[PDB]
Ligand binder design. Structure first.
Ligand SMILES: Cc1cc2c3c(c1C)C(C)(C)CC=[N+]3c1c([nH]c(=O)[nH]c1=O)N2C[C@H](O)[C@H](O)[C@H](O)COP(=O)(O)O
Ligand SMILES: [K+]
Ligand SMILES: [K+]
Ligand SMILES: [Mn+2]
Ligand SMILES: [Mn+2]
Lengths: 496, 494
């Protein structure tokens, strides 16, 4: 379980041991069939499929779908996500967030540099690079291209060498040795590419695919600007990530990565990129010009495994990775700012388009505030952070509900948000531009989409509550609840 | 399965046969413990408990909890609800609504009057009535009193005999022969009670508990004013509900009812009633005066079964009966009005505080309208109906999503409702008074709580859609979906 956080291939073997992997020996087609199978996996919360035989691919190459999809067994539903951190099968949202925040306070552990690693078993330089020999999928029927990178991370470094950035972003196949993909300017790849542009230079770059599962997660996390993901990963697993130099450009990448691509990000050349089915659950019809990523060389492990994300309606890894990592970061932002927040959760059902903030009702009275002022304080703090910029809508609710349970968030939205008083739009705050409901007005302006929905009743700002909860937990005395819990299977219910 | 719609005792036996009833022979206390156990049932979607061994209660008397609670098996989740209509284990929300709507179109089938029936096996008159001998529960810790009636229906009739009304409402025990509970003026009990009061008279009344499951559902339904529930029930099951007359006041009640109460609703006498854990999930702290229901006589079957509802957080019968019934009625109301609506669903998770309307996107462009004007059209039509009065919030979304699935509703709310454009408050429209978020200013005005949340993208009003959906159903061609489903076991998924 622990080695799984640090070694993709081992992670795969451990899922199999958990009964959470299906070995697909059938020949499958990288043209849409992989994608369709993997979508059905997500939606049924089926085991992760390991595809062993992809039509017309490099012999022995493999593909892993649904690397952090959910399981149908509610008791173990988050286990595949949890395994990315070496956590056990029953770990839930709260356990994962608390782990990730402990790592934020721990001293970083820098990567350990090695001479050699399995990612070097096969090496393709220059004209030997032919990305089309990999099992590169056409993921959705209406996508603009096949995607090589949907579950790997970009690896760049500040010109000054002070900041090593690992970040997940998509990369479409353009040709035998060129990809293209977005570099949004508020993302760390955009920021670092701009630093190179100010020197007149393209950005040296690599991508790691089938990377250590914990590094993949951290690559998916909006850590603050200037924080090296590699050292955060070391802190989290409590030992260094072992890294090797690329063949051609001096970047350090994980030594046991399945597949490493290397080259540079062009200053000015672009290819029409996308569209792709995306995290919000939709497939917009038109692509946009995006920077070319020139692949100068690449290396891979024997029988290399390409993990993928078949993005779309929830739950897929834009929810279970992205969402979860955003949640942990936002709770840290919120607490460090002195907000009375004890949990944040980006509900997977809301497709990483809202974040629910659990409010410590024991702390709210002392603020001497009200809903509107509180909403504006939270909007400023949260949307102002690197992590909160990513999420357009915030819901604030008291911590009597569990924010990780959509049914309880629903109850609170319906029964606590007052139509006249509790819907706070923040149309001056700049938007994350992928948000699906933005209209042309919002796009021209760069703002319009942001919202806080308040589910704190007015009396909660005075430390009061209009009514108790009519539930087993809250409508019966403690000794009675224990008698019922104790006698339950003896009444006749057994396991029910 | 059809007999279950018509006979409570049979319905119980059928649940047991399906594996959906637990017989509790351990001794239990009606003071909270029954309540607590049955709350946990709902919450765990456990089978329904039949309690056979209750402290200090009439010998042979039984209590049924969670009469239409949900099951944990997702494929059979709604069976217990479905069985109220004689529908099979796999029946879902859409099947149920389709059946209830078919019954609206069908000619009423009036009840069949019988001389005799099992509810008359035991008769208590006058001084013989002692309601406290029953296993009358204290349902929640902070309730103001024990409730005799939480899963039974009031039976009254217009002074002119034209309208026979069956309707579910709570009744709190006051003493050995008096109960008390609300008769809110917009409900049919309240309306009919006011007709008697205009004659200077109390209203003759009975309550049926452990009544035929289909009659109970209908009693829970906001049929239009003047529509006799008993006729609708006969149209629904295809045959007469068999009824007998009460001992003392000429009302006709179902013949195989477990327990029938009868007396009258006082013109002016009140007792402090409530509070009670309620539909919306909460226990408010203070009770209010409500009319006395004088119990002159009662009758019951041997070994009578008292069914209860332990109201509160979802899903309980305020959701699965009440919400499901409202939903069916609202869909009829919408369609009769010419609204492009193909399903309505009061999500159980929202505790009967919102209704989700599935909009037929093929019909929307022809209206030549926009979100604000449509929301107002829908608000007027829906909130002005008897059914829609009851629900403060409406969500409008295109019918590409399945509105009976909360996860899909959430997706739409998160990804479609634009913060600047799609939040339509209707502060002049009169509220249902039980809505929990209402403030003092709303209560004094009698309005303020109503809202329409729009999740129709603007381009849907022109028949367009900015993007397709990236799912197994929508991102792959039909031949490929069929291939995947056909080869699923070949791939290794078993
Ligand atoms: C988990 C994950 C996160 C993706 C993502 C994917 C997944 C699977 C894909 C590849 C399926 C779909 C889109 N990816 C993009 C992405 N961010 C981005 O700027 N462009 C992307 O194309 N994100 C989010 C990004 O990885 C997080 O915002 C990180 O915080 C970025 O790292 P940074 O904070 O250091 O910039
Ligand atoms: K990152
Ligand atoms: K009714
Ligand atoms: Mn970063
Ligand atoms: Mn009626």
């Amino acid at each position: 379980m622990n080695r799984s956080a640090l070694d993709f291939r081992h992670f795969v073997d451990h899922l199999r041991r958990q009964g959470d992997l299906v070995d697909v020996h059938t020949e499958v087609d990288a043209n849409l069939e992989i994608g369709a199978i993997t979508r059905r996996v997500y939606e049924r919360r089926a085991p992760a499929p390991l595809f062993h035989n992809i039509r017309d691919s490099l012999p022995g190459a493999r593909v892993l779908g649904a690397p952090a999809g959910l399981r149908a067994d509610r008791a173990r539903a988050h286990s595949r996500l949890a395994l990315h951190f070496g956590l056990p099968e029953h770990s839930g949202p709260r356990d994962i967030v608390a782990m990730l925040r402990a790592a934020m306070r721990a001293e970083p552990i820098a990567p350990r540099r090695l001479e050699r690693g399995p990612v070097q078993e096969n090496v393709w330089l220059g004209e030997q690079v032919d990305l089309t020999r990999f099992p590169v999928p056409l993921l959705h029927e209406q996508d603009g291209g096949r995607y090589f990178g949907t579950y790997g991370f970009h690896v760049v470094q500040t010109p000054d060498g002070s900041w090593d950035s690992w970040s997940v972003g998509r990369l479409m196949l353009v040709d035998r040795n060129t990809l293209a993909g977005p570099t949004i300017p508020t993302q760390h790849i955009g920021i670092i590419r701009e630093q190179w542009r100010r020197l007149g230079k393209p950005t040296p770059w690599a991508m790691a695919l089938g990377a250590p599962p914990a590094a993949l997660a951290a690559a998916g996390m909006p850590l603050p600007e200037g924080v090296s993901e590699a050292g955060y990963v070391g802190a989290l697993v409590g030992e260094p990530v072992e890294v090797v130099r690329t063949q051609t450009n001096g970047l350090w990448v994980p030594a046991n990565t399945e597949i490493v691509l290397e080259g540079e990000i062009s200053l000015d050349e672009t290819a029409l990129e996308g569209p792709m089915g995306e995290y919000h659950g939709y497939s917009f019809p038109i692509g946009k010009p995006q920077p070319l990523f020139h692949v100068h060389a690449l290396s891979f492990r024997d029988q290399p495994i390409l993990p993928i994300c078949v993005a779309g309606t929830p739950p897929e890894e834009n929810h279970t990775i992205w969402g979860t990592m955003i949640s942990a970061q936002l709770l840290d932002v919120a607490q460090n700012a002195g907000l009375p927040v004890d949990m944040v959760w980006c509900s997977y059902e809301a497709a990483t388009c809202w974040a629910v903030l659990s409010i410590d009702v024991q702390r709210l009275a002392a603020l001497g505030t009200d809903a509107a002022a509180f909403a504006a304080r939270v909007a400023e703090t949260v949307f102002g952070s690197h992590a909160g910029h990513l999420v357009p809508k915030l819901i604030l609710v008291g911590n009597d509900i569990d924010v990780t349970e959509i049914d309880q968030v629903v109850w609170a939205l319906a029964t606590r948000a007052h139509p006249l008083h509790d819907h706070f739009a923040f149309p001056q705050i700049r938007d994350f531009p992928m948000v699906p409901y933005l209209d042309a007005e919002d796009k021209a302006r760069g703002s319009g989409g942001r919202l806080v929905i308040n589910c704190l009743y007015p009396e909660q700002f005075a430390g009061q509550m209009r009514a108790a909860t009519a539930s087993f937990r809250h409508a019966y005395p403690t000794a009675l609840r224990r008698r019922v819990e104790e006698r339950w299977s003896d009444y006749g219910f057994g396991d029910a």
